[PDB]
Amino acid sequence: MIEKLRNIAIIAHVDHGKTTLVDKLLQQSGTILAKNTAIKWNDYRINIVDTPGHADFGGEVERVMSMVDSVLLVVDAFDGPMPQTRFVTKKAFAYGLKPIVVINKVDRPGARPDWVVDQVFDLFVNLDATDEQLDFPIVYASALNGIAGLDHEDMAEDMTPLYQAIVDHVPAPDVDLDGPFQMQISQLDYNSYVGVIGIGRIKRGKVKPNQQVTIIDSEGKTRNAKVGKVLGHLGLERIETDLAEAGDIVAITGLGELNISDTVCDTQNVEALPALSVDEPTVSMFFCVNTSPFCGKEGKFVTSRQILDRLNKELVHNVALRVEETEDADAFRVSGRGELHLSVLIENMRREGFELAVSRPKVIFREIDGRKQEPYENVTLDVEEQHQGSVMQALGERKGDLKNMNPDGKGRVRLDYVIPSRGLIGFRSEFMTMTSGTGLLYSTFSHYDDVRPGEVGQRQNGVLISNGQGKAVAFALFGLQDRGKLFLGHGAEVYEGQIIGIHSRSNDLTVNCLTVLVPPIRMTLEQALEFIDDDELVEVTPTSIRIRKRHLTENDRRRAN
Ligand SMILES: Nc1nc2c(ncn2[C@@H]2O[C@H](COP(=O)(O)OP(=O)(O)O)[C@@H](OP(=O)(O)OP(=O)(O)O)[C@H]2O)c(=O)[nH]1
Ligand SMILES: [Mg+2]
């Protein structure tokens, strides 16, 4: 009794029918999405918790999964599953949740349900349990009409098969109704009338308005408070309730500054629920003050603490990242998930109005049981068949181990790889031009494991390094084309230590561009960041970035060799 509850989270790539599907289930029942939709189906109560967009919204994806006992993956019947919902699905699997797959928009012409079933099945190469990829039921749906069915040619007149599937395959909450009250805050909310609102799934006991309560944070500090209002979810709404009990997803009111991972307990049985998530970072990278002779030239805020300041503001936007204090009091060791994670952070701090020097990204090594390990990750690539042998050749040099390949039948092909992050770093640049911009690459962290012995191929070419500061003249540049490709044309302002071109040969060449042209190479941030070597840096400024050596002068470099 009182276990007719079904707490489920819903996942769907944008414009795949998740707002429209839940919108049916609501109107066909006895009861933008809301962060939670409550649904009455006969005597079952279904909580459909919405998942956020496909950026790390502070890691709300783990918070949401912490409140649900199953996940509902909605998939377009033609386009199939999209890579953007990779990580949300991944985390649902990490929380041991078994999925319910809804294949929507099945009434569209060209719909290929058989194909998207295989795609979704294959996508569950999220090293997930046999258990999870086993026996995930499949419901076909056309929410535009409101049709659900276990087959797509045979189909019910409404959404009943979906309800039934939810009831049948979603476990009831693992909660104790008789124990003392216990509830962890999973999300927060505010209304100028009520104050701060705390949201979670009651793990134990029951709660009434005006009940006395004790809140314990992660570390173990406690305070006493009196709950004001207990708000239960009904439609897209919250009504005041006189009673909420274990398994219920509700919102609480009378408590003060509730923090996510706070545990609300009966005053005499205070027991904190374990703080839940952390994406351990896997790629480190150094942010530095821009030591260039172009200090404050194109960027407003450029100081040591000026950077460290914002280096403790984005800490809360993001638990995947860390920030550390280096001994050089003008440079900092910031780590993240992928190189893509840290990259756009700069591209934002760029037009956030900054100026900083940044190293090349390296994997964070870890020692486990005396044996050092590194991060490996899953890579899937979609190229044409003309590049097939080419990108295959390249990935093997970066210690990529081929696991699968699947021709499109229409001239393309998808490859699958297990690769150390070490070998994958900065590939995208080499990928696109190689595949001429048509190929597609996706990556997902898998596991740490014993390092692959050896090193990845270095840059091979050397760089043309400026010997002085001034405006580059076309007269000189024309002479440099005899021995490489350039990064600028006539009239560009340069200083000493700056890298201005790519040497045709292997060694670094200090060159003078101060004493008509072929088109210059302009490098995007990512592009240029993949180019940089360990003894070099990228200088980033609000409308463009420069490539520079660590030691700016000829003499200093020679000493360091
Ligand atoms: N053929 C077919 N189409 C479906 C179905 N379900 C949803 N759609 C289409 O997708 C659109 C709904 O967008 P959602 O898919 O619900 O948005 P969401 O991913 O963020 O949840 C509808 O038009 P829309 O509301 O005008 O889109 P928009 O203007 O809100 O972006 C409708 O055209 C279906 O079962 N069959
Ligand atoms: Mg929309």
Residue numbers in the entry: 1 to 31, 56 to 539, 556 to 601
Task: Show the paper's wording.
BipA (TypA or YihK) is a member of the translational GTPase protein family, to which translational factors EF-G,2 EF-Tu, and IF2 also belong. The translational GTPase BipA regulates the expression of virulence and pathogenicity factors in several eubacteria. Full-length BipA can be subdivided into five domains. Beginning from the N terminus, the first four domains are homologous to domains I, II, III, and V of EF-G, whereas the last domain at the C terminus is distinct and protein-specific.
To gain a better understanding of the effect of ppGpp on BipA, we solved the structure of full-length BipA in the presence of GDP to a resolution of 3.1 Å and in the presence of ppGpp to a resolution of 3.3 Å. In each of these structures, the nucleotide and the coordinated magnesium ion can be localized unambiguously in the initial unbiased difference electron maps. Surprisingly, the structure of BipA with bound ppGpp is very similar to that of BipA with bound GDP, reflected in a low r.m.s.d. of 0.28 Å across all matching main chain atoms. Even the GDP portion of ppGpp is in the same structural environment as GDP by itself, forming the same interactions. The additional 3′-pyrophosphate of ppGpp extends toward the 5′-pyrophosphate group chelating a magnesium ion between them. The crystal structure and small-angle x-ray scattering data of the protein with bound nucleotides, together with a thermodynamic analysis of the binding of GDP and of ppGpp to BipA, indicate that the ppGpp-bound form of BipA adopts the structure of the GDP form. The small numerical value of ΔCp for GDP binding was interpreted as reflecting the absence of a conformational change of EF-G upon GDP binding. We, therefore, similarly conclude that the presence of the 3′-pyrophosphate of ppGpp does not induce a conformation in BipA different from that seen in the presence of GDP, a conclusion consistent with the above x-ray crystal structures. GDP-bound BipA has similar values of 32.02 and 32.68 Å for Guinier and real-space Rg values, respectively, and a Dmax of 107 Å, as does ppGpp-bound BipA with a Guinier Rg of 32.21 Å and real-space Rg of 32.94 Å and a Dmax of 111 Å. In the case of BipA, it is not simply the GTPase domain by itself, but the whole protein that adopts the same conformation upon binding of GDP or ppGpp. Our results show that the binding of ppGpp to BipA does not induce a nucleotide-specific conformational change, suggesting that both the ppGpp nucleotide and the small ribosomal subunit must be present to switch the binding specificity of BipA.
